[PDB]
Amino acid sequence: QNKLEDVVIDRNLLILGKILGEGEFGSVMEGNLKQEDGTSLKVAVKTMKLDNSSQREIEEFLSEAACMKDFSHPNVIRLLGVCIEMSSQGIPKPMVILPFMKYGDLHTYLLYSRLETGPKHIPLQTLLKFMVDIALGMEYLSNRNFLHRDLAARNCMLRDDMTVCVADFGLSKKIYSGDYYRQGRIAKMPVKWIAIESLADRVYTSKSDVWAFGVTMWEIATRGMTPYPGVQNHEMYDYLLHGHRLKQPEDCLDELYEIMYSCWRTDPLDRPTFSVLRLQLEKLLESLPD
Ligand SMILES: CN1CCN(Cc2ccc(-c3ccc(CO[C@H]4CCC[C@@H]4NC(=O)c4cc(-c5cnn(C)c5)cnc4N)cc3)cc2)CC1
Ligand SMILES: [Cl-]
Ligand SMILES: [Cl-]
Ligand SMILES: [Cl-]
Ligand SMILES: [Cl-]
Ligand SMILES: [Cl-]
Ligand SMILES: [Cl-]
């Protein structure tokens, strides 16, 4: 009840503004959080669409959030706290309160960059820095024995200084911890980012995150293409069983593509660690002009 009390933010300190995004598993809203100093802080608010999905009490949700509040790394989003809102049937509904990242998610940013009004055309070297940024965040998380489990460009956020941070921890957990959700919440995992072994069995390790990182690198290199053009979601497991993998994007350095495809080796033990990936990418980025 020290870190558990500390993580909770009083609901009255929060004013909800507009909905920024709404999906099957929750919504993101703008909000304002009244400070101790009398000032207001702009925040994002993530709601969860919980309808009998959990097999633990809300304390469990809070203790996981408390652990994540301790994350301290430029490439990992740091949550501010959690607010609880009671349903009419007396069920607590948690709200994760995050600092507001003005540029939004990396995926959408990449797409906007392909329009005249958007961000300017993103140079190869900046694309590569995005990938290093994500590698550093995942290295930090994997060093703390966290499994991300929803690693995609849409769940990476852009800070005011164009630093990417890893976000959307809704499915994240410590290796060896129990499930918070029942069988219903793997449905949030997008199929085209799921490692072959995790499609075969309810099995997910840090090497499954490495696979998803390689898919994320590919999304970045293609400036936001959906993985596996021409392949439907329900075909993916067979496609991968036959040894097919993401194709090399146009203008992608051969070196970079080698790094990506090391992430999709059939045996998880043949995939690199995030430390190795990160160093390979830093080296590659260093080897190029300014
Ligand atoms: C199994 N355990 C059970 C218990 N769980 C507890 C728990 C569950 C979830 C989280 C958690 C942590 C971080 C996030 C943030 O994720 C972002 C990526 C995706 C959405 C979302 N977006 C924004 O947050 C955002 C959007 C915008 C913006 C700008 N422009 N536009 C259009 C939007 C501006 N700033 C932002 N910060 C969500 C949930 C933490 C703890 C653990 C697991
Ligand atoms: Cl409100
Ligand atoms: Cl942060
Ligand atoms: Cl978002
Ligand atoms: Cl596209
Ligand atoms: Cl492909
Ligand atoms: Cl190819």
UniProtKB/Swiss-Prot annotation:
Phosphotyrosine, modified sites:
Y176, Y180, Y181
The active site of this protein is located at D150
Kindly provide the PTM information from the record: Autophosphorylated on Tyr-176, Tyr-180 and Tyr-181 in the activation loop allowing full activity.
Give the residues the record marks as binding ATP: L20, G21, E22, G23, E24, F25, G26, S27, V28, K42
Coiled-coil spans in chain: none
Q: Which domain of life is it from?
A: Eukaryota
Span of domain Protein kinase: 14-285
- What mutagenesis or variant effect is reported for A135S? In a head & Neck squamous cell carcinoma sample; somatic mutation
For the Cytoplasmic compartment, the record's topological domain ranges are 1-290
Give the UniProt subcellular location, in the record's own words: Cell membrane
Tissues showing expression? Not expressed in normal B- and T-lymphocytes but is expressed in numerous neoplastic B- and T-cell lines. Highly expressed in testis, ovary, prostate, lung, and kidney, with lower expression in spleen, small intestine, colon, and liver.
Q: What disorder is listed for this protein?
A: Retinitis pigmentosa 38: A retinal dystrophy belonging to the group of pigmentary retinopathies. Retinitis pigmentosa is characterized by retinal pigment deposits visible on fundus examination and primary loss of rod photoreceptor cells followed by secondary loss of cone photoreceptors. Patients typically have night vision blindness and loss of midperipheral visual field. As their condition progresses, they lose their far peripheral visual field and eventually central vision as well.
What's its job? Answer: Receptor tyrosine kinase that transduces signals from the extracellular matrix into the cytoplasm by binding to several ligands including LGALS3, TUB, TULP1 or GAS6. Regulates many physiological processes including cell survival, migration, differentiation, and phagocytosis of apoptotic cells (efferocytosis). Ligand binding at the cell surface induces autophosphorylation of MERTK on its intracellular domain that provides docking sites for downstream signaling molecules. Following activation by ligand, interacts with GRB2 or PLCG2 and induces phosphorylation of MAPK1, MAPK2, FAK/PTK2 or RAC1.
Can you tell me which family this protein belongs to? Belongs to the protein kinase superfamily. Tyr protein kinase family. AXL/UFO subfamily.
> Subunit arrangement?
Interacts (upon activation) with TNK2; stimulates TNK2 autophosphorylation. Interacts (via N-terminus) with extracellular ligands LGALS3, TUB, TULP1 and GAS6. Interacts with VAV1 in a phosphotyrosine-independent manner. Interacts with TIMD4; this interaction enhances TIMD4-mediated efferocytosis.
Protein name (Swiss-Prot/TrEMBL): Tyrosine-protein kinase Mer
Which species? Homo sapiens (Human)
Q: Which gene encodes it?
A: MERTK
